[PDB]
């Protein structure tokens, strides 16, 4: 089955989205942090990356940017997920790498219509 | 104070409010969409963050209008005798489940036997309590195992002297005079993520000054804080 | 921005919020506490009301964020080709649970044939007209059988004229040229009970100003009010 | 059985205390604003009135007022149910004669037992 790294410092966020994840028979990866994150990706390598962007330690902006300057890990699709709704906020992202950037509040049947479509 | 922090005043109402709703919209959707296939316990267990999210973002909605009854005088305070020990360990127990998120172990101490009888709103100081010791583990150090919040009660100058001390980030000296004013954040690389509206320590000020008492800071950036709140007796 | 109205602001945002916040956590605990006795029909209705009453929260942190961007003046306008009639008619839909919850008639007339095409952004017109609607609906009368918001569409001047009419509670004649400003409200017997941060039209003011248009209000108190947005064609 | 009106604008709060108080048996007679809750009052007698304050037409600081004039409507306990929670505005509400101020947001559970203290 497909893994996705989830990548957010709110516990109860990654609940919920990971529990809509496993609906569908992903496996999910979680870390709390952008640095923590780009540890994982030493064990092993995701089929699709959600990202936050406020997150302490290392901000999702540092990931994207730390993602494309990698060769393994720049073709790795990201859906940013995130309360950061601007639109510069979302042009920044996109020029960062992201495939998509979803806000917060996000529909959880909408937000995994568009994780298969990446997926797929 | 002025008008750029008003702008960023409310889009900081927005994002901290924001974070709450997420929560309370995605998992009853999820509930709604996914009955087939919720287990009882989970089902039970996600209609309870939907209330202790609601419970949050509530206390976010006191604040603001807390805030608004103390800038238009509208706001009294009622004294009577109360046990600050007992206060204290209350509002130690109201914050351990926050702190717990954060890895920040919540601590106290009584330079003085207790029990520490007071004249006091016990309401209202709990609401000073509770805004120093959330502040104590939003402001927490970043990675580091032996993160803490405590409070150290004592007998001082015919009053009562509370110490909430942490080994957080701590606060540069041009900021220390300005963190106890309306909006006023600290903007920093170690503040960025952080929720918050600027009117915690305000609120704060104006409670321990309509007590007759009053509120300063000790700081050292990168080593913690230290907040003491004397009252009269 | 002043003092006073500051302060207002402020516990404004409070009550507004507090309302669908209690639906909220009432019809959650109630779920919790009652499974064993919830038939799944009320289940499903009470989850449904979380749903709605969490998007109506939505829309108001929306708005507070949306005036702060266009206070740093880093709300963006993209502009495209739109139809004006499916704009409109698309609002109205939107409405209509809200105007039906005050016994509010929502009509679309248009004295131009449809379409009318318009070099818009659609996002944020459309959020233009569920402002003006919403304030239709919020300030009309309190107990009349007749109560309606009107959304009219014309061409004029080289461009779209919209009006939006009601008949419901107007504006008194001092207030008229201060109601465009960020955090001003009516303070009168008719509106003590409306909820508001009175950002609404400070923020359809500046989308309509950076579509190189512009709004202004004729009112009547006791008869009602038509607000008339101009936003040029191409 | 015994009856409560319930007073209040919102009829999606309306449904919730109703949906509490007859999980209990009580009989719920319901008014959309001050003014229909009085008329109510001519066609039968309450055990219990819950009653918000912020409502069109007549607000419940004026139904308090004018519950007090009339020797009949007087004798029936009120709790007012609101999102005005200033120590002034309780103080005020229990002036005029309400029994007791609970808060918005409110207990479900603690609003019941409360009702249930009143009524017995
Ligand atoms: N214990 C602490 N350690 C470090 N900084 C603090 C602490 N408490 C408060 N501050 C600083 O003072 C500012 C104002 O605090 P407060 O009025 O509670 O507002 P808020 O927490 O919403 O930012 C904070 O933004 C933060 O920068
Ligand atoms: N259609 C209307 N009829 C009567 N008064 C209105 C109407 N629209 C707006 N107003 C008045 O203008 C004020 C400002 O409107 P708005 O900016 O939308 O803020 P809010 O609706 O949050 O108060 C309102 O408080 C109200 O008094």
Tied chains: 1, 4.
């Excluded at chain 2, 609601?54 to 509208?74: G, M």
């Amino acid at each position: 089955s497909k893994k996705v790294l989830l990548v957010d410092d709110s516990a109860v966020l990654r609940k919920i989205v990971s529990f809509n994840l496993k609906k569908e028979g992903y496996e999910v990866i979680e870390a709390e942090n952008g640095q923590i994150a780009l540890e994982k990706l030493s064990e092993f390598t995701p089929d699709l990356i959600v990202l936050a962007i406020m997150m302490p330690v290392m901000d999702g902006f540092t990931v994207l940017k730390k993602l494309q300057e990698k060769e393994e890990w720049k073709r790795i699709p990201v859906i940013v997920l995130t309360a950061k709704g601007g639109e510069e906020d979302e042009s920044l992202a996109l020029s960062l790498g992201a495939r998509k950037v979803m806000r917060k509040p996000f529909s959880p049947s909408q937000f995994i219509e568009e994780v298969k479509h990446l997926l797929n | 104070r002025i008008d750029r922090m008003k702008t960023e005043f409310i889009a900081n109402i927005s994002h901290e409010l924001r974070t709450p709703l997420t929560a309370i919209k995605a998992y009853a959707e999820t509930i709604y969409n996914s009955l087939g296939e919720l287990d009882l316990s989970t089902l039970k267990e996600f209609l309870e963050v939907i209330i202790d999210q609601s419970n949050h973002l509530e206390n976010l909605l006191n604040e603001l209008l807390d805030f608004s009854r103390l800038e238009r005088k509208s706001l009294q305070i009622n004294r009577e005798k109360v046990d600050l020990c007992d206060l204290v360990e209350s509002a130690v127990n109201a914050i351990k489940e926050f702190a717990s998120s954060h890895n920040v172990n919540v601590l106290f101490e009584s330079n003085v036997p207790c029990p520490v009888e007071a004249y006091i709103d016990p309401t209202r100081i709990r609401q000073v309590l509770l805004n120093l010791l959330n502040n104590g583990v939003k402001y927490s150090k970043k990675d580091a195992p032996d993160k803490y919040v405590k409070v150290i009660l004592d007998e001082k100058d015919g009053g009562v002297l509370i110490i909430v001390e942490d080994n957080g980030i701590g606060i540069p000296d041009h900021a220390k005079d300005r963190i106890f004013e309306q909006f006023y954040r600290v903007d920093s690389s170690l503040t960025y993520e952080v929720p918050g509206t600027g009117l915690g320590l305000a609120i704060t000020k104006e409670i321990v000054e309509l007590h007759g008492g009053r509120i300063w800071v000790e700081s050292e950036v990168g080593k913690g804080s230290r907040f003491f709140v004397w009252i009269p007796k």
